Design a binder for this molecule. Sequence first.
Ligand SMILES: NC(=O)c1ccc[n+]([C@@H]2O[C@H](COP(=O)([O-])OP(=O)(O)OC[C@H]3O[C@@H](n4cnc5c(N)ncnc54)[C@H](O)[C@@H]3O)[C@@H](O)[C@H]2O)c1
Ligand SMILES: NC(=O)c1ccc[n+]([C@@H]2O[C@H](COP(=O)([O-])OP(=O)(O)OC[C@H]3O[C@@H](n4cnc5c(N)ncnc54)[C@H](O)[C@@H]3O)[C@@H](O)[C@H]2O)c1
Lengths: 489, 489, 489, 489
Amino acid sequence: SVYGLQRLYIAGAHADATSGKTFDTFDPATGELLARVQQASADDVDRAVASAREGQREWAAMTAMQRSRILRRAVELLRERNDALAELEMRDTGKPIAETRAVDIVTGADVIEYYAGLATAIEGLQVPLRPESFVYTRREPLGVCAGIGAWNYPIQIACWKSAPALAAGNAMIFKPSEVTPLSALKLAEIYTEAGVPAGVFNVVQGDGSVGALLSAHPGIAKVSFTGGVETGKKVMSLAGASSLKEVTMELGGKSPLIVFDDADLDRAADIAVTANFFSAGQVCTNGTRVFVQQAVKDAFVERVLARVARIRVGKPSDSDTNFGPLASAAQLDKVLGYIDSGKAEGAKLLAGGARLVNDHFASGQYVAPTVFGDCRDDMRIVREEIFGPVMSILSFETEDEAIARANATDYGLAAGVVTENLSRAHRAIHRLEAGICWINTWGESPAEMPVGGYKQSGVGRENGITTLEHYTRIKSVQVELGRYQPVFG
Amino acid sequence: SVYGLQRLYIAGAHADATSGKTFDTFDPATGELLARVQQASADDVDRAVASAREGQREWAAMTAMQRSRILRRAVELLRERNDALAELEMRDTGKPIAETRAVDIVTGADVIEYYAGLATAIEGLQVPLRPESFVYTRREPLGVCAGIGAWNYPIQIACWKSAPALAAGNAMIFKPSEVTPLSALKLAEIYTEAGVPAGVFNVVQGDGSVGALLSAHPGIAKVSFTGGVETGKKVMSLAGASSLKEVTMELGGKSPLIVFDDADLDRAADIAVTANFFSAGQVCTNGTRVFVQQAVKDAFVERVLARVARIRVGKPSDSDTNFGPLASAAQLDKVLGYIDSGKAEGAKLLAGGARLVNDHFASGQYVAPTVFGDCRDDMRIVREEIFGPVMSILSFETEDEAIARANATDYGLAAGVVTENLSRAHRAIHRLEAGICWINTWGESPAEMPVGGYKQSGVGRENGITTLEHYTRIKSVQVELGRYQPVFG
Amino acid sequence: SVYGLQRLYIAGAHADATSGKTFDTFDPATGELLARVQQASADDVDRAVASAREGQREWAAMTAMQRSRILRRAVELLRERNDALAELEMRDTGKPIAETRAVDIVTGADVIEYYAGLATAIEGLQVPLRPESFVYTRREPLGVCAGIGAWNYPIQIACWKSAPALAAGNAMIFKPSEVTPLSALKLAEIYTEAGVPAGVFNVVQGDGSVGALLSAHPGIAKVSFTGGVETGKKVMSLAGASSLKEVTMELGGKSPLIVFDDADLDRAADIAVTANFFSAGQVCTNGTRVFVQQAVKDAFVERVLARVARIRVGKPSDSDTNFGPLASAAQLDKVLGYIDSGKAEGAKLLAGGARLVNDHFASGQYVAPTVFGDCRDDMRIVREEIFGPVMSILSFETEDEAIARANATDYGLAAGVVTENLSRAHRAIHRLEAGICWINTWGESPAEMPVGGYKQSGVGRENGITTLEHYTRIKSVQVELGRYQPVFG
Amino acid sequence: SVYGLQRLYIAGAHADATSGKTFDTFDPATGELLARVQQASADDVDRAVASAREGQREWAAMTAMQRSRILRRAVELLRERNDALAELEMRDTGKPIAETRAVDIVTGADVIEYYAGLATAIEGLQVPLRPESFVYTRREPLGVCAGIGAWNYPIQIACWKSAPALAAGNAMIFKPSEVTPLSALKLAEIYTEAGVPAGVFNVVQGDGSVGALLSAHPGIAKVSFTGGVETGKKVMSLAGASSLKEVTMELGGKSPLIVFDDADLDRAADIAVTANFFSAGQVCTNGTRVFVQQAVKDAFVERVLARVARIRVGKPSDSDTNFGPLASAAQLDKVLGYIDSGKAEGAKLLAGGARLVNDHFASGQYVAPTVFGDCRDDMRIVREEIFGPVMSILSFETEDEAIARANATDYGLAAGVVTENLSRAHRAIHRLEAGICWINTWGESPAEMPVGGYKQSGVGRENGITTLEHYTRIKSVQVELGRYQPVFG
Ligand SMILES: NC(=O)c1ccc[n+]([C@@H]2O[C@H](COP(=O)([O-])OP(=O)(O)OC[C@H]3O[C@@H](n4cnc5c(N)ncnc54)[C@H](O)[C@@H]3O)[C@@H](O)[C@H]2O)c1
Ligand SMILES: NC(=O)c1ccc[n+]([C@@H]2O[C@H](COP(=O)([O-])OP(=O)(O)OC[C@H]3O[C@@H](n4cnc5c(N)ncnc54)[C@H](O)[C@@H]3O)[C@@H](O)[C@H]2O)c1
């Protein structure tokens, strides 16, 4: 194996698990074994909670500025090690090195940096009731938080969950996806090197059974989960049933991109291609239902296909590549099944549609960038999240029609519109039932911008000032300065 | 029956249920039948959701000030009808008319009044990213919210759940406790009279199975529940597993009141009595573990018992009464079982301890105000919420000991201290793991003050500005004003 | 006279001044004497301050909700008396009854209503420093505030200054313009009837020398002034030099309206006419420099002139009138001098340009709606605020040129653009140096929206949540719970 | 001279003035000439404004995080150079090296660090008006700001004024006191080294005439001033009269320290000594009216005198010194004049009272730590700020008396109480008319805590989130998405 045996990270050090079990992580471009990874046992999760409880006490007793400085040092280390971490993330995920060098660590560190600076701005309120009595609130740490990661943006997710948790004075136990377990360990080392106390960021490893141990643990105050809707429902159920934990969930989507007849069509085609094929289509917010107004449909499709034909499919370790394999064979099987469904249900295959098996591609999990035209709302590929590089193009006649069809889903993660018109841009966005909305762009997720789902695409939010506040619990304190008037007299 | 046949309230009118089933509500002071009440079916809940969806559209399309004015009119009607509603609430709950006339409707209307004024102050954010792009957020209504009530403060709970929901532009379907189904229908009539559109406040009736219909319904965006911890775990589980609803939960407690050696002991005894015997002990925030420092224990207990002996136990319809029956026979059986447990495990009975069965008391559910001394942390009466008039007095030696023992519970609703010392008052409160904290007072819950539980006593909060914010969902809108730089070039 | 002798309003009643001096107010449509008005002396201002100090104590001692309810009662009275107050305001100002019935009292009451609801939401902060110490802030009333009014919106200005001051717990002494002294006394009667304590809203009367008495008085904590830039500089100077008062200033402008080549030209012409001729041109925020892109200049001008020709100039007491006289002979002389200047410097007269003196118009102060074309940036009519019905139309070629020329002024009150393009609308507004910015509309000033000037057009803001915050002063309280470590040991 | 010829700092470099004039700065411990400093001319101030305008454009066009990183680098440099800057500040001010090494740069950098992290959290609002229209606000930089410093905390004041100004995207032109001109130049170098663009922090030098050039300059948007009340009144007057600048002022005080009969008397004596003799008494917030309740007066005075006798008066360059000379001969003359007044008016001299003239002290400006007892409210030393090491002790009988006498002043900067009682601590502080209030401590000014004066002790605030917001101006933007309804039709 490339990276050897990897283990748990508890109490400021790498540590042997006590399960007697390991799992494998692979390079999905080559099938090379990257590491054997020890799986945490229930005892290990218990120990990680005890460790986090102890570290949280020391961390929360520091001043807000002491925490700020330590997180700022972690940011420095992430910037310094960006390229090395990007190489590891590329190996583990299959995403192109051109992506992991520019996006994954950059934006992960961006959010740690943002919350490092805001760690001093967490304030309660004060309000008088009368001259003799007033109320103040404290925003106290929750305690020990759990984060459960997905495999498409492993280190970015670890950063985005741990940053507001740590900035607010919590500890976090993080479990990466078993598909991509490696970079979370590097973040744990960096937090320790930056000065984070032992236990404040612990990493446990394993499959969903280890995630369930975290969701059920009575010593954990909050769970933050990124993954599929079916798993999210199990997590929220168990986290609530076990000990009434606070919950945040980010759960995938079938987000609509609406290209109006007064769109800039070059802009629209660029957006649609980014919104469907970045990270080989494995992005929760991807704009996978592309609604295009009839009058510009043919011109728009011509532009999309010309851009899709120029995608540089290749080895993700090659800097010239901008589209690589999917992250697993299970991914490839599911995506190819959806492509079969689209063909069977009468969608028109306009580009791609098959696994690449020539030369080195045969050793990886490569599916061509795929575009279906003449799609209908009742098709499986239109109704269900594919989580791969499959664009569905749907025509519409009127603005009201596009909005109604865009909203006719139980998903609600993202939405976007392309139009040059001032009124249409805002009025359409205001009617779309999604938490993350883009006008004349797609995909950017600034640290300042709260992101999360409507409907079954999630609960709660990440990023922005509001998310830092949601990693605290409110204590209201009423001070009575006057005589307590007896109620029983 | 006193009040006749009572039904559902859907789409601005009373309406027949379709379950084929009814349940009875009684006067717990006399056993008189107050009403036969129709139970909602699954199809009735569906109809209530469709009605709420329609009303929510009209309500949200109004301006914030239009909603504010209508809620202010509802406040006027609640003030005008205070005494008539207080009589109804006294009949249904058994709480003294002296309480329901001064507290239940007054404070329910107080919170509607507060949120009416704040309905115009729900604001998103704006933040620039660069000259070419900026973000704004919208705080949009969730849609249809569900509220599930408890029987100890029926109309107050209905007011506190519906006020922020309606002010933020939502509709609410409310289910009162089957023990106290009557006053919620009066609130629904009042909202309609005040100008609330049909469907914006609907009432369904029934036992826990009807509450579960609401928690599972895919058309409901949020559930707010008041009740016991074990029911709350079931609700949060089903609400999350069904459709990833947002959840607020207020779940009872075993709140500590710490009387220090430098407390004003008259103040402390007054607080302890209020904190244990108001509403015949049926208050979630009651200070039912009374910790008293050894040096003042005997003097404190003497003062407590002198006040307990002056409690005016009697018919709740008599204005001179300040302590009446419990709300049901099941409540009485549970409370009497706890008294049996306390005696068996060795707690010293200092006052009360038995059912009152002389003269008219035999026809009601009356338990004497009960005080146990020499309690231990391991006793069932100290570990478990009794939800009746049973005070447990525990001695301690040191401040560190009192704080450790106060925190050694999975509950976390309220806490309080009595001390004349500036440093001790705040330093102790800051270390107590509870959401609702009182210094030299107990029990007041101003509209401005967020209230809710730590640990297993709750999720989320009620009241205060922050609670209005959590009856909206955040939509982030990024506006790109410049060229979209192609990612696939 | 129509309304008789009018006096001061101090300590909850009308009261004789002690200056020995009076001044007259006239109806600018007819020259009829409306009232003889007593002028306040320095000793009267002292008495008003002592009265305000006493009333402020009672008012601030009330709860926030008590103040909220009283302000809401004042709103009810203003709505009930809207038409009678509108008639008075039309007589005193000369503005059409169609305006005063729909705008002046409606929007004055709108802002009192908004702040009434927010009076309960004034909150300080709390922030911990370390376990042993924390800070909270109080937002305390300033004390006695002064408001100085202008004659174009007399009762609206009185409402907008007094509403945040009173909601925050202050008293206010208000001096209306000597041109329009009457409606402020009616507002003072209404506040008293609504339950405002004696002294909380006092009215003094007189010219600028009485305004200076308020600005200099050592017992006044803050001055809010509406008026011309040159008077404002005198007020802010004296307010600061006398006792370091806080200051809010709203000072008029020369606001640009930019009509782009992709504007809806019917929309643009409607906006331009409203933005220049409402209230006979006597609006501080009027868009009196109308920049029009060359390609649409002729078509835009044709539409403007067609609308100007349909303005209904007439008696302001007739409901069919939508354009009446100016508020005084001094105003007319100034406006006519500007028209003379524009003609001399070469501006092309397109409409209007002279006093109306036929039939009844001869008895009033009427100037025709006037439009100049082919204007230059160096013209006096383009550089200087006219405060009358005189539109200056300026052609431009490029967007960069329009923005540069729009910004090339020491004014900075308002600005606006007309364009159908999403990018242009926001990018242009973000570059315009004005506090009040409109896209595809003009003139609306919602209670939620902070309004005020950049550069020499003002200091501070009115309306919105932030303005309520600036009618309080911050007290920071640090609580030390631990040992004070000696600095001199 | 020790440091040679020092000059202006404009456009990223040291620069020759064009006045032909210099002034001298001295070491007040020895009379050694530290530097000749060039005085800025009017042309130099004009050039500094043009430079600041250009640098502000580049600085504001950066992202908030780019500004944050550059300010964070400035903090690193200040930490690295703390001891060297502390030595310079000790030479220029006369304050003990034990103070300048621990306080002046530490807390100056603390505030830059705080605002560096908050530079990303400056947000406007968004609020809907109706489906067809919404408002958003921008918080835009003011532009070029001016800061005018005092000599008691030269580099700390430069940091505290420049930090929120720069974090919010402004440039600042700073003029240090001519008594202490040196360390502001070092801060300017550090900002440049950290990456601040040329012109964003410029330093001009000279006496009050140069300060007046800044206050009058039409290109400056805001003035922030620290100094005496008489000068503050001139600054606010001229800043308002010239161009309606925004103004912040911090202006000295006569702050009361109230020692109650239930104070910890050792704590109280420690506080009183710190609050009167730190920085040789040259602190604006010093607690120079020490009110002591009669029952503890003698015990309190005995403790104060014992601590005063242990003050280590000596050379400020000696690390063992904790009390050095005053900053100038003019200071010494004024302080000795006040001491003469106290003696003449009958105050009892309890400690100190004279200049130290033995050995090396004769070459410095040394006044002994001085305590007066049996003071009265009508004494000059009690009514007027001395700005030197002169404590006035006043006895009182009742709590109401102490509060009334504490408030009977036109000052209102700080106040504090010493008491062990919870109720008394808060109820007294809530009644004291001062912006900066301390319970059982004195003098700490955390970055999170807004600080400034009531009454004639100031306008506006420094520090806290609120001050960052006051270095922006609000632009409200109304977007109309629907049809503009013609007003003239
Ligand atoms: N503020 C609070 O935290 C608060 C106040 C009042 C009561 N309580 C708690 O309520 C308890 C009362 O117990 P109880 O057995 O009479 O009532 P409960 O807790 O079982 O029921 C409360 C409400 O939930 C409904 N319900 C019951 N089972 C449900 C289910 N599975 N799904 C959905 N809704 C369901 C009930 O019909 C009722 O409306 C007290 O012991 C106390 O702990 C809490
Ligand atoms: N919102 C605004 O910015 C706004 C709205 C209305 C009017 N204005 C301005 O008001 C101007 C009207 O000019 P005007 O000469 O008739 O009135 P003005 O500006 O001189 O006076 C306005 C008010 O200030 C008082 N006043 C006058 N001199 C004073 C002094 N030295 N100290 C204190 N108060 C003093 C007046 O009595 C009156 O109440 C218009 O040209 C326009 O620029 C501004």
